[PDB]
Structure formats: C-alpha cells, structure tokens
Amino acid sequence: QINQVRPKLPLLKILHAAGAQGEMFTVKEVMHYLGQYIMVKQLYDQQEQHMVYCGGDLLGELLGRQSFSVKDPSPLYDMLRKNLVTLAT
C-alpha cells in the first residue's frame, strides 16, 4: 500500500510458486517471498549461502543467467533494475 509498481512477469510467477498472490510489489515485498522460495526450492548452496544459482530457474531462463553473490550490491542492483520494473539508469 506504498503506491508501489508491478514486477516482471516471471518474477510474479516465482512469487506465485512461493504461495503468494499479487500484482504490485516493493523489493521488500518481493524479498519476503523470494527468500522463502529459495529456501523451499533450495536454490542456494548450504556451505556458501552468500551465492544463489538462479541460472537453472525461470529467473535464469528470462535473463539468460541469474546466478550471483549476495555480498556484492552493485551488480545485484543492476539485475534487480531489470527484474523489478523501476526508474534509474
């Protein structure tokens, strides 16, 4: 209810697969369900949780690659800006 916008359609399918329902979502509203999705699907390595391997996911089939490290916010913001539709650049 923060006058927020809609994400990319495969992101909305990943949110539905997490058990959610929606149209408009913030990065925080996405993340609540995306952390839950990655945990229930196990899209991470138990020993290196600082990486997620979405290149094998719908996020990967959309972007051609979506495997990344969570410790590096700059390339992560560049990916987010393509998967959650917004301003910038």
Q: Which residue has the tokens 């539905």?
A: 16
DSSP state of 3: S
Closest separation between CB of residue 27 and ligand 44Z, Å?
A: 5
**Is residue 5 a contact partner of residue 29, using CB atoms and an 8 Å limit?**
no
Contact pattern from residue 5 through residue 24 relative to ligand 44Z, giving x for each residue in contact according to CB under 6 A and a dash for the rest: --------------------
76 binds ligand 44Z (CB under 6 A): yes
What is the contact surface with ligand 44Z in residues (CB under 6 A)?
27, 31, 34-35, 38, 44, 49-50, 52, 70, 76, 80
